[PDB]
Amino acid sequence: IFKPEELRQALMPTLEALYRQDPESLPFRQPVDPQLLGIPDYFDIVKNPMDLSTIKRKLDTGQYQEPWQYVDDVWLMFNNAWLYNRKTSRVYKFCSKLAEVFEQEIDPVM
Ligand SMILES: COC(=O)c1ccc2[nH]c(=O)oc2c1
Ligand SMILES: COC(=O)c1ccc2[nH]c(=O)oc2c1
DSSP states (O other), X not given: OOOGGGHHHHHHHHHHHHHTSTTTTGGGSSXXXXXXXXXXXXXXXXXXXXXXXXXXXXXXXXXXXXXXXHHHHHHHHHHHHHXXXXXXXXXXXXXXXXXXXXXXXXXXHO
């Protein structure tokens, strides 16, 4: 059982492990900007965007009350990238690498 005030110390190492993957985490560090990136259909396809900076802000500022909410946002981020990007694409393959790192880091914590 985690109390809300324990979540950052327990879960931040799993998020730091994702950020440490370079270049794999770079497309995930900030919200997808469809006009900037030249992908104007992004928000037509992806209904609930999520990225590392949003997860980090929520974890820093006490917006998560239970660990499932953090895990849920991490999988939202990965599933959005698998949904929007083609299986052959750089971002999709980076997503798969990050998801493998995440599974290895989150399992001992939970
Ligand atoms: C999207 O998932 C959920 O709405 C949800 C809600 C409560 C939970 N309690 C738990 O342990 O996992 C949960 C998952
Ligand atoms: C999580 O980041 C994406 O889903 C993403 C990022 C950069 C991209 N550049 C592009 O052409 O598609 C992209 C998709």
